[PDB]
Amino acid sequence: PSIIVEPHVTAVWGKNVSLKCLIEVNETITQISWEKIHGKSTQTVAVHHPQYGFSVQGDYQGRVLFKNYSLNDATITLHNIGFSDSGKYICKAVTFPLGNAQSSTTVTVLVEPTVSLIKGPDSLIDGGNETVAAVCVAATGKPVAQIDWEGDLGEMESSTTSFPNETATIVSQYKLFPTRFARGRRITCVVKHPALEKDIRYSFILDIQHH
Amino acid sequence: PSIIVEPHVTAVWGKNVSLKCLIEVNETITQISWEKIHGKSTQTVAVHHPQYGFSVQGDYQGRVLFKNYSLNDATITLHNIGFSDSGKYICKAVTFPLGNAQSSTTVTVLVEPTVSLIKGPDSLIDGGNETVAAVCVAATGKPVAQIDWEGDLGEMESSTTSFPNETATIVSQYKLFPTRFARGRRITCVVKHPALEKDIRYSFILDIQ
Ligand SMILES: *[C@@H]1O[C@H](CO)[C@@H](O[C@@H]2O[C@H](CO)[C@@H](O[C@@H]3O[C@H](CO)[C@@H](O)[C@H](O)[C@@H]3O)[C@H](O)[C@H]2NC(C)=O)[C@H](O)[C@H]1NC(C)=O
Ligand SMILES: *[C@@H]1O[C@H](CO)[C@@H](O[C@@H]2O[C@H](CO)[C@@H](O[C@@H]3O[C@H](CO)[C@@H](O)[C@H](O)[C@@H]3O)[C@H](O)[C@H]2NC(C)=O)[C@H](O)[C@H]1NC(C)=O
């Protein structure tokens, strides 16, 4: 309506997110609140009342700040984000005399992957058969990270395991036939994920041996 | 929930009703209100706020009174009851901090019939053909009334004519074969209707010759 909110929002596990709400009703504001859908019932996250002040409820206590004291600005920030913070929220303005108005914001919780780049277990002998030259892991991210490789020296093979909390670990091995042409060149693991401000990039120089 | 109301209320057109609502939810009450369901949205009927006062909305203005100033008593009275007052209402208490709680009341609007008894067009002469001794009309009642007769001097015939506002008129003629035996007798019309506390009764003494 005149309840201005962002319709869809992502939140990174263990960081902060802002639940924006501007109230332009041109009406007398009785109180304003954020609520969370639970079945058909809703549960209160935070309340502002012009005489009774703020209130934060449930497991949100200690993790919710009201941006400012204006009754027309219902924006809050949520902190120490966890999986249960996902779902549909309602910003609500109760007004006098016409009553309530609202708009919804759905929150998706993302988890940053833990990335590591490791060398293959076997040494890369020139003229030898296909060997795993490196292994890139992006562990327990939500959703699963994406892994790409730079340096066209071979081919990629990956597996993914998803977990009850809906994070996923992806393991990607880079396979190549060692040659003279590949010696001294650099292979890069590139991990893309929506919780990342920029792609994680790890690389190292190929060591190709003698005989 | 914690909202005490009556599930269903009968209301008579042109009269009064109370919509009862007692609120003791345990916590600070920021405002209380009665609302009317319109589609899936609701229209406000009346609102009581501790600092802002009473407020009445729509076509309820001049027809709604709050029973008292107590925030725990949302009871109102509705006056000059009209067809549109029919429908489903919700009493609603908004509280601080947990928010609103509500309960519904459904209102049916009845219309009292206008009842009259007349002595029939032709005059009452003996040994002859059936003659209409009296006509009883319960007009534009909602729903249609029932008409019964007391005094066992003949049979009745009745017709019903419905109207767009959902009131109906029923006209009942009482026919009899006139007899010297029937003079001094009283015929009685009895009209039954849910808007009536008792049956309406109109009677008169048959005059034969
Ligand atoms: C979502 O579920 C996954 C699957 O259980 C969670 O991953 C697990 O997290 C624990 C705690 O960090 C990991 O254990 C730790 O790592 C090594 C184990 O060898 C050890 O050095 C540490 O002291 C500790 O034991 C566990 O390995 C890991 N399981 C995996 C990656 O398969 C994940 O943390 C959950 N995420 C959230 C946000 O709840
Ligand atoms: C529900 O429906 C019927 C039909 O619209 C309404 O009945 C009509 O009521 C009016 C006024 O009560 C009657 O007409 C009036 O007659 C007087 C003479 O007594 C005259 O002064 C007025 O100008 C007007 O013409 C009319 O006889 C009556 N019609 C029938 C067929 O009975 C009824 O009032 C409606 N009721 C509600 C609660 O809305």
Swiss-Prot record, chain A:
UniProt subcellular location: Cell membrane; Postsynaptic cell membrane; Cell junction, Adherens junction
Keywords: Cell adhesion, Cell junction, Cell membrane, Disulfide bond, Glycoprotein, Immunoglobulin domain, Membrane, Postsynaptic cell membrane, Repeat, Signal, Synapse, Transmembrane, Transmembrane helix
Annotated protein name in UniProt: Nectin-3
Tissue specificity field: Ubiquitous with high expression in testes. Localized in spermatids at Sertoli-spermatid junctions. Expressed in ovarian granulosa cells, but only faintly expressed after ovulation.
Domain Ig-like V-type, first and last residues per copy: 2-108
UniProt similarity note: Belongs to the nectin family.
Annotated function: Cell adhesion molecule that promotes cell-cell adhesion through heterophilic trans-interactions with nectins-like or other nectins, such as trans-interaction with NECTIN2 at Sertoli-spermatid junctions. Trans-interaction with PVR induces activation of CDC42 and RAC small G proteins through common signaling molecules such as SRC and RAP1. Induces endocytosis-mediated down-regulation of PVR from the cell surface, resulting in reduction of cell movement and proliferation. Involved in axon guidance by promoting contacts between the commissural axons and the floor plate cells.
Source lineage: Eukaryota, Metazoa, Chordata, Craniata, Vertebrata
UniProt GO cellular component terms: adherens junction; apical junction complex; axon; cell-cell contact zone; cell-cell junction; dendrite; hippocampal mossy fiber to CA3 synapse; plasma membrane
Residues of the full protein shown: 59 to 266 of 549
Keyword Cell membrane: yes
Disulfide pairings: 21-91, 136-189
Chief subcellular location: membrane
Ranges in coiled-coil conformation: none
Consequences of knocking out this gene: Mice show an ocular phenotype, microphthalmia, accompanied by a separation of the contact between the pigment and non-pigment cell layers of the ciliary epithelia. Male mice exhibits infertility, suggesting a role in spermatogenesis. In the hippocampus, the formation and the number of adherens junctions at the synapses is impaired, and the trajectory of mossy fiber is abnormal. In the auditory epithelium, impaired formation of the checkerboard-like cellular pattern of hair cells and supporting cells, due to aberrant attachment between hair cells.
Gene Ontology terms describing biological process: cell adhesion; cell-cell adhesion; cochlea morphogenesis; establishment of protein localization to plasma membrane; fertilization; heterophilic cell-cell adhesion via plasma membrane cell adhesion molecules; homophilic cell adhesion via plasma membrane adhesion molecules; lens morphogenesis in camera-type eye
UniProt GO MF annotations: cell adhesion mediator activity; protein homodimerization activity
Sugar attachment sites: 16, 26, 68, 129, 165
Organism: Mus musculus (Mouse)
Domain Ig-like C2-type: 113-201
Swiss-Prot record, chain B:
Superkingdom of the source species: Eukaryota
Loss of function: phenotype: Mice show an ocular phenotype, microphthalmia, accompanied by a separation of the contact between the pigment and non-pigment cell layers of the ciliary epithelia. Male mice exhibits infertility, suggesting a role in spermatogenesis. In the hippocampus, the formation and the number of adherens junctions at the synapses is impaired, and the trajectory of mossy fiber is abnormal. In the auditory epithelium, impaired formation of the checkerboard-like cellular pattern of hair cells and supporting cells, due to aberrant attachment between hair cells.
Every Ig-like V-type domain range: 2-108
Annotated ranges, domain Ig-like C2-type: 113-201
Intrachain S-S bonds: 21-91, 136-189
Tissue distribution of the protein: Ubiquitous with high expression in testes. Localized in spermatids at Sertoli-spermatid junctions. Expressed in ovarian granulosa cells, but only faintly expressed after ovulation.
Sites carrying sugar chains: 16, 26, 68, 129, 165
Subcellular location: Cell membrane; Postsynaptic cell membrane; Cell junction, Adherens junction
Known function: Cell adhesion molecule that promotes cell-cell adhesion through heterophilic trans-interactions with nectins-like or other nectins, such as trans-interaction with NECTIN2 at Sertoli-spermatid junctions. Trans-interaction with PVR induces activation of CDC42 and RAC small G proteins through common signaling molecules such as SRC and RAP1. Induces endocytosis-mediated down-regulation of PVR from the cell surface, resulting in reduction of cell movement and proliferation. Involved in axon guidance by promoting contacts between the commissural axons and the floor plate cells.
Quaternary structure, from the entry: Cis- and trans-homodimer. Can form trans-heterodimers with NECTIN1, NECTIN2, PVR, IGSF4B/Necl-1 and with IGSF4. Interaction between NECTIN1 and NECTIN3 on the pre- and postsynaptic sites, respectively, initiates the formation of puncta adherentia junctions between axons and dendrites. Interacts (via Cytoplasmic domain) with AFDN, providing a connection with the actin cytoskeleton. Binds with low affinity to TIGIT.
Family affiliation: Belongs to the nectin family.
Name recorded for this polypeptide: Nectin-3
Organism: Mus musculus (Mouse)
Portion held of the full protein: 59 to 266 of 549
